[PDB]
Design an enzyme around this catalytic site. Structure first.
Site, short mmCIF file in Angstrom:
data_model
loop_
_atom_site.label_atom_id
_atom_site.label_comp_id
_atom_site.label_asym_id
_atom_site.label_seq_id
_atom_site.Cartn_x
_atom_site.Cartn_y
_atom_site.Cartn_z
N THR A 16 0.59 -0.91 0.03
CA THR A 16 0.09 0.26 0.25
C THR A 16 0.58 1.78 0.14
OG1 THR A 16 -0.02 0.02 2.15
CG2 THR A 16 -2.30 -1.04 1.89
N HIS A 69 16.09 -8.23 -23.81
CA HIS A 69 14.21 -7.30 -24.47
C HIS A 69 13.72 -8.70 -23.87
CE1 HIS A 69 10.79 -5.22 -25.60
NE2 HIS A 69 10.88 -4.36 -24.75
N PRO A 175 -8.95 -1.66 -27.14
CA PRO A 175 -9.88 -1.05 -26.15
C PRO A 175 -10.10 -2.67 -25.50
CG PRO A 175 -11.02 -0.29 -28.01
CD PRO A 175 -9.94 -0.94 -28.26
N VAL A 177 -8.39 -5.41 -24.02
CA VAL A 177 -7.00 -5.89 -24.03
C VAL A 177 -6.31 -4.71 -23.13
CG1 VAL A 177 -6.09 -7.14 -26.07
CG2 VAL A 177 -5.12 -4.59 -25.77
N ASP A 200 -5.07 1.22 -18.94
CA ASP A 200 -5.53 0.96 -17.66
C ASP A 200 -5.72 0.66 -16.57
OD1 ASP A 200 -8.19 -0.82 -20.07
OD2 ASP A 200 -6.84 -1.16 -20.52
N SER A 224 7.68 -1.89 -21.76
CA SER A 224 7.80 -2.48 -21.60
C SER A 224 8.09 -3.60 -20.59
CB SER A 224 8.93 -3.13 -22.38
OG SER A 224 8.82 -2.55 -23.93
N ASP A 260 -2.35 6.95 -6.29
CA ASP A 260 -1.43 7.30 -5.23
C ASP A 260 -0.28 7.92 -6.24
OD1 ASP A 260 -2.21 6.87 -2.76
OD2 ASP A 260 -1.85 3.93 -3.01
#
Ligand SMILES: Fc1ccc(C2=NNC3=NCCN3C2)cc1F
Length: 279
Positions: A16, A69, A175, A177, A200, A224, A260
């Site tokens: 938190t 990567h 939208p 995903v 999201d 990434s 936050d």
């Protein structure tokens, strides 16, 4: 379970508050789930993967990660020290060459590959795909990501590193995903992170330590790096039976740490991925 002296991003997703260094998580640890990492490959021989990683497909002369990567992203999903879901199975799909580049047609083929290939794998707790890649807007790329999600795979995608609205990038702008922005260890939006209504969720993305090729480790930054935190979190929550592939993005947003993060533009969600684990 408690992992002391964990990378900051793992500690952040079980906290938190910023500023702690122990990662707390249920010992099930994504066992019985699977995560596809669609990238430059994965160095499956890295001791950090403990035999739980394997390459399943490449579009190039080797399935080896000659870049790093993909190995770094896979490590954040599921490596023993650097991973969110430390017991998941990791499947590599090499759609990017060793310079990190790839044609959109190959990326689309790789997504459709995963939608079918999951039927060749044992993933009783569910299937996730982590896509730490992107480019300019393409309806065809978005549709491929939407198909993968529709097929029963939790798709997490990078928002992009342009400090711009992700509506102009793909697959970030699809939208259906889970589009993931990046934050830093002080709960600031990462300086490069894209933003906008299509995001999201945010995850740790600045200065993320994980596995690298040659059996090494290093710290790098990007959306990434945030994306596999969310992918691994989804696998972990699906193993716990708390959510499903179709609903995991919404569940992660609903249970996120809210309000936050700093420097979040008006109209972008202020939501930071959080496992809500009570030790
Ligand atoms: F909101 C913030 C609060 C403190 C810092 C800080 N900068 N740098 C720093 N080095 C050691 C401790 N510490 C705090 C950054 C923030 F973004």
């Amino acid at each position: 379970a408690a992992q002391t002296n964990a990378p900051w991003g793992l500690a952040r997703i079980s906290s938190t508050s910023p500023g702690t260094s122990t990662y707390y998580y249920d010992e099930s640890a994504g066992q019985g789930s699977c995560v596809y990492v669609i990238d430059t490959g994965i160095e499956a021989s890295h001791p950090e993967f403990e035999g739980r990683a394997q390459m399943v497909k490449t579009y190039y002369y080797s399935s080896r990660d000659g870049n790093g990567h993909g190995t770094h992203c896979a490590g954040t999903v599921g490596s023993r020290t650097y991973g969110v879901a430390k017991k998941t199975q990791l499947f590599g799909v090499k759609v990017l060459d060793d310079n990190g580049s790839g044609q959109y047609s190959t990326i689309i083929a790789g997504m459709d590959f995963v939608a079918s290939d999951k039927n060749n794998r044992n993933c009783p707790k569910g299937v996730v795909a982590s896509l730490s890649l992107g480019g300019g807007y393409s309806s065809s790329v978005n549709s491929a990501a939407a198909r993968l999600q529709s097929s029963g795979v939790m798709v997490a995608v990078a928002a992009g590193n342009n400090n711009a609205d992700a509506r102009n990038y793909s697959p970030a702008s699809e939208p259906s995903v889970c589009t993931v922005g990046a934050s830093d260890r002080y709960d600031r939006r990462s300086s490069f992170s894209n933003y906008g209504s299509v995001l999201d969720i945010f995850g740790p993305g600045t200065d993320i330590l994980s596995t690298w090729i040659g059996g090494s480790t290093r710290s790098i930054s990007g959306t990434s790096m945030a994306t596999p935190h969310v992918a691994g979190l989804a696998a972990y929550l699906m193993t716990l039976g708390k959510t499903t592939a179709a609903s995991a993005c919404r569940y992660i947003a609903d249970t996120a740490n809210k309000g936050d993060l700093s420097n979040i533009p008006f109209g972008t969600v202020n939501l930071l991925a959080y496992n809500n684990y009570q030790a």
